[PDB]
Amino acid sequence: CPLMVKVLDAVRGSPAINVAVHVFRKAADDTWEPFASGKTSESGELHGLTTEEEFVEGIYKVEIDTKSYWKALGISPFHEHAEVVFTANDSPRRYTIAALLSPYSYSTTAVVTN
Amino acid sequence: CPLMVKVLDAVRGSPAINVAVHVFRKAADDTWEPFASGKTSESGELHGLTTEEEFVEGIYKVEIDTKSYWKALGISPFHEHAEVVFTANDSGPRRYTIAALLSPYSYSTTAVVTNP
Amino acid sequence: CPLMVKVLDAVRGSPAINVAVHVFRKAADDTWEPFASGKTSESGELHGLTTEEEFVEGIYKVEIDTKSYWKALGISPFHEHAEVVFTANDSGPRRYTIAALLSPYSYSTTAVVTNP
Amino acid sequence: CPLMVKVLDAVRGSPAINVAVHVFRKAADDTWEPFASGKTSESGELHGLTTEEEFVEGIYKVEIDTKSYWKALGISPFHEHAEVVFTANDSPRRYTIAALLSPYSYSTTAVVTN
């Protein structure tokens, strides 16, 4: 599993469950190409987005549909989503994209390991 | 000032100086139209991006050029740039402060929204 | 102003107002001696805690009373209070801004350190 | 495992390895009593600090020795440590205390689950 997403709720102190995540790859013409997607599990985790064979070097965008998440909890959010844009690089790389969510704030970190 | 950006450096314990910022607005046709751009000052702040008249209701994207910043300092960062996307002024004019705290492999961003 | 505190609310997208702050200094005998205290204003800022003369070299603890804050608003938070412990002024006098961003189950804190 | 600590490095984008963690319980006389301790593993994780039988309701402090961590990497840190003070409460509770570290900044979150 080369690319994993982890999403947490800073208001309830829990995994953020059933959050839609869309991954895009940057094409040669600079448009964003749909690459992979899913919903976070009960652990707030999203696995099996892609394989090592497909996950070539390039610029990727991970879009976390945070607005819909806060809406379903009855809370008015600030952001449309959270966007994590980065270059995948063969020179470590099991990528964990973690995001902590608040109504008016989010943080994201990359955990890159062998 | 209706839209302002503040950036801090979590490695140096300092304002993030000379950080390029590009602001876009979602157009009728769903494309990101260039709206405003600037660079953070010595205080890590960016003011005078727009006016109260030009800053109408819409979906805005604030792109903080974090990679260029860390690179300009001999650090190879994870992110290309931090992207803050939000609907602004949908219940009348508000004033927005987009705050960001930067580490090479992490950032957090928060919004301060006040009613003038 | 050599020591200042700024607090934001990540739930409301606002300054955290009326947040109690207690500052302690490590004494010769290793105990935490009361140093200064105050409350954040409408801007979420706390100034005038100490002077440049009183703020000598030492290990300081800034206690931001986050539980009291969230409780005063009908939210049951995780943390009792955020604790920022640091050595100050060990290479001559500096000015410190302790910044904190609060969520019910999370906070981040950063330091802005400037040479006057 | 009622209490788990996870520590990450925001500069290198990795688990923070070999970080000393000390847990204290608040005594009736308001002093901090040594409760449990350890070093974070290669995954930046610390498990088996305590058991359900011992982890009774009360105020606990998790002290993360961040200064020593940054020193060993040759980096001058701001904080003496990171302190996470909280009440353990029987009314969820598998507690994960997560901390993300930078030289002049840290964030911490509680992930509390059933």
Ligand SMILES: O=C(O)Cc1ccccc1Nc1c(Cl)cccc1Cl
């Ligand atoms: O991911 C973030 O940036 C938010 C954050 C803040 C404080 C402590 C931990 C985390 N994230 C986090 C968590 Cl809560 C668990 C596993 C891995 C990570 Cl990166």
Ligand SMILES: O=C(O)Cc1ccccc1Nc1c(Cl)cccc1Cl
């Ligand atoms: O800016 C953010 O979103 C994160 C953050 C984390 C910890 C401490 C401060 C901040 N932000 C922040 C900033 Cl960038 C300026 C003034 C006051 C604050 Cl609280």
